[PDB]
């Protein structure tokens, strides 16, 4: 039925401890400090609510998935690893492989992706409008961000995954494996502690487009489809 590498991913999830699987007080969310550039794994773990995947399990699954996807022409792809990051399409598939497992039983887990780019002849996105979320209580964003401070430092745009979760009171929380905002200057001093910030995802996105240069954004989550993101008011 299932490929051996996909089954291995499902097996690891089934053995994971997920104390933040459901809505919990914000202090109980599972948020991992960043390791290398594994923010996709950290965001997946915050999304599901526990250390569901470790870096070795996820990287092994991703490599085998690359082999099945394109086989011996894999040398045509840019590297994807804990050291260089992962495509939003891989995060979608990993999460959809968990639909129907005993941990996700009774939960909306039809995961899809929506991707927004600048208008023609525009350098950045001027506005991101989220779809109506209904009762959705978990999301992952992949954002590509530049800024005046980054240009002044000669730094590349940051391409970064974060997670959002609703707590037991219904308030949204940004769960970020980095210790500073995506739009912060690259030389900013920090404590290393992951970001746990009470903010609506729409307000967080508006904060990026107001403070920095949003080049691209991917929204991943239950009930999300290709047309979910728009760039006009609602």
């Amino acid at each position: 039925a299932r490929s051996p590498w996909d089954q291995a991913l499902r097996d690891r999830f089934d053995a994971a401890l997920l104390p933040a699987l459901g809505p919990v007080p914000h202090d109980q969310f599972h948020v991992e400090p960043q390791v290398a550039s594994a923010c996709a794994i950290h965001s997946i773990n915050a999304f599901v609510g526990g250390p569901a995947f470790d870096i070795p399990t996820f990287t092994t699954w991703s490599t085998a998935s690359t082999a099945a996807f394109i086989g011996d022409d894999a040398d045509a792809l840019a590297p994807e690893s804990a050291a260089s990051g992962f495509s939003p399409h891989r995060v979608e598939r990993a999460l959809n492989l968990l639909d129907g497992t005993p941990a996700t039983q009774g939960k909306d887990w039809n995961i899809g992706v929506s991707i927004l780019s600048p208008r023609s002849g525009a350098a950045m996105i001027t506005q991101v409008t989220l779809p109506a979320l209904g009762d959705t209580d978990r999301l992952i964003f992949d954002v590509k961000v530049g800024s005046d401070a980054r240009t002044a430092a000669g730094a590349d745009d940051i391409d970064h995954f974060v997670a959002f979760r609703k707590d037991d009171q219904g308030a949204w929380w940004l769960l970020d494996s980095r210790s500073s905002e995506v739009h912060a200057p690259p030389g900013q001093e920090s404590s290393g502690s992951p970001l746990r910030r009470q903010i609506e995802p729409q307000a967080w996105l508006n904060e990026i487009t107001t403070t920095a240069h949003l080049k691209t954004v991917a929204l991943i989550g239950p009930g999300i489809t290709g047309q979910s993101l728009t760039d006009v008011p609602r």
Partner: protein, 75 residues
């Protein structure tokens, strides 16, 4: 004619195309079906990246050929 476009989501997109369609037109058909903006689409055929200004015939892409689609995003 039909061609297939695999993605790392594991879903394969089926497109109705003609040999004279440009890669730009093909990315427009992918956007209409899946919503992926064309500037985020990187299309590959047999290990070769496809240029927007060329056509399917220039790459000898025929009916039921399989293309590979990857995003430029890599968080």
């Amino acid at each position: 004619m039909q061609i297939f476009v695999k993605t790392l989501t594991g879903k394969t997109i089926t497109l109705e195309v003609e040999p004279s369609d440009t890669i730009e037109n093909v990315k427009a058909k992918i956007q209409d079906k899946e919503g992926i903006p064309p500037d985020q689409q990187r299309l590959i055929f047999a290990g070769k990246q496809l240029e927007d200004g060329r056509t399917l015939s220039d790459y000898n892409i025929q009916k039921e050929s399989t293309l590979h689609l990857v995003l430029r995003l890599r968080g």
